[PDB]
Symmetry: C3
Subunit: 239 residues, 3 copies
Amino acid sequence: MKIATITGVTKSPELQVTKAIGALILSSDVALSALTTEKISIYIERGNGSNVILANKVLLKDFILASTYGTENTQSDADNAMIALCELADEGSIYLADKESIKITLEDLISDKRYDLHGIEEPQQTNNLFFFEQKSVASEEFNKKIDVQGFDLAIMTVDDSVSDLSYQYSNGQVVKYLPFELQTLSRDIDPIQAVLSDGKVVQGLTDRLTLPLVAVVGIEINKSQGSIINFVVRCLKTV
Amino acid sequence: MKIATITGVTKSPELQVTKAIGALILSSDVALSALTTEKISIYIERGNGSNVILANKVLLKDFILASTYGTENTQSDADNAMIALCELADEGSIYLADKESIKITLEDLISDKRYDLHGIEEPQQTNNLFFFEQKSVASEEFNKKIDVQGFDLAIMTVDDSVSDLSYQYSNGQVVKYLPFELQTLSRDIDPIQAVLSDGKVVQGLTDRLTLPLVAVVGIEINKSQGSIINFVVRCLKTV
Amino acid sequence: MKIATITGVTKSPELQVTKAIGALILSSDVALSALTTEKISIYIERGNGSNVILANKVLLKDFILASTYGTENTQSDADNAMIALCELADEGSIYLADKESIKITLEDLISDKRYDLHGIEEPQQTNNLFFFEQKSVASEEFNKKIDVQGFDLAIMTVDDSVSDLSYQYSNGQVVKYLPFELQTLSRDIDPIQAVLSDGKVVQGLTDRLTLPLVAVVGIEINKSQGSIINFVVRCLKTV
């Protein structure tokens, strides 16, 4: 189904979906590397109760890269220069109750650009949903320790001020990596990140790095002053 | 082994193979998108009995796209601009009886083009074979219902007159899709469809769409007048 | 960790590693197809005992292609035109004893080129290691029979003088292939071999061919005079 087509206005209206969907399709005429500040927010609202927030002002690039990791990748077309498919459930669709509805909003758009939303529904229903969280490391701190237990993927902002990044595994061993080593390990699993319209392919962005977290309980980052490091994590859980 | 090399003549002679092969290799100097009307027909002939028809005047593009879906894709070379490998069995080769032989013919070729056939045989033998069937929707009908039970793949002609396409699953649920949604779902599984000689890659043809049918028993197509829609289906069965 | 950066000198010093690593990272500013005669040698030395040789003057191209076969492939970057990851163990790292150390050396380099080595370590430890062996067919012999039992991959030098290559399977069946058929079968499993910096991709080298050996005990090569054929084989075994 078709949800909305946004152009001209810098902010999108709160779009309400009553049909149980399972995935979202983002289409735009700008390249993946051209996204600067577009943000998305998706949440399921109940009736006489409290809302459930899956994404709260998450960057469009991070949202796209957190759902197209693996065999699949963001594609292109003659009309749309960027098409991405993002999963919201594990293997089915969201099971809506008597008074639930999905609500999607977009923030910080561009006046002379177009963005189209599509919904994908499948017969299977499931309760496992994806939750997105954000973590920040300031430009003044030297060493920062963060907890990533229970997560399976992460996206980190790439900068030249980052020196070392050390994992903490479930068995207690600690392994330290360089940014180049982390990038090589990331590209070892997913060689192609996106395909352009003319035919060229890109293996990754120049400012975002995807880290697959398997049996990782903590990450310690050592860097210097100058930039703020952003981490976006995704988890799967039952509501 | 080498079967035949055809050039100059618009029709190929009936080529007979007595060795138990397991796959076919098509090589040509034209691009995959440049194929217009080439047709192929493959059938196994018995002795004192009736023949078995696996492909009966199937389009070359459909035959190529129905066998190179997934991890593999059609490749290129310095000499040949299109190389494709098509499987005829499940995991082995055709078990020929006392008087069986394979026969392959080509129709509607081009005078100034070259087409080379190769055969691939493997030690394992199997009885499961692939059968190709064709279905048509006329340019006058608005809504058409077809049955695709027992099939695992389909190829549909792409046109701008198609409005909606609805699946019927084994559990009874009916889901309707748009052509754009179907194309996105198709490209989600197989990102790259072919690789050109210069280095560029193409994610799909401009007039053919591949649909993986899993637990699908019927397809209902709603469109307008103007074009004829062609469906090519492939099934696996024991003879 | 960082091992060494070599430039200006035609030979690299014997580099000693005391930390238990699990993989090697090769980075260079030359393209993969531009490698001509660079050779590598890696061996683990004990204390009061005999050394263990895993690679003894193996060509850089063969070493790279014998470890990047499958989903992964050699990548590129803005600074480095060739980045490759080569595994030395099965799923862990080498378990060093009380007096063991890894030693890596490079031979036949280029004066105006740069080569950087990196080490990758993971918490898991294992005893299964990879061993590389070389076989040669002279330019005078017509038919040569070689044994490849126990191996899972091979890399053969590509030349126009090779006529036929016949496998011998575990069940006794013998299947003969042409170089074109072998290349098509090789590209069927791994479509993309490397990705260039500008965006183009290459599906394989013009002088090296990768053969996946599954349940193969012998290979018989029939050719003519004119060139020397080189085979590089890799095996997994416990020390």
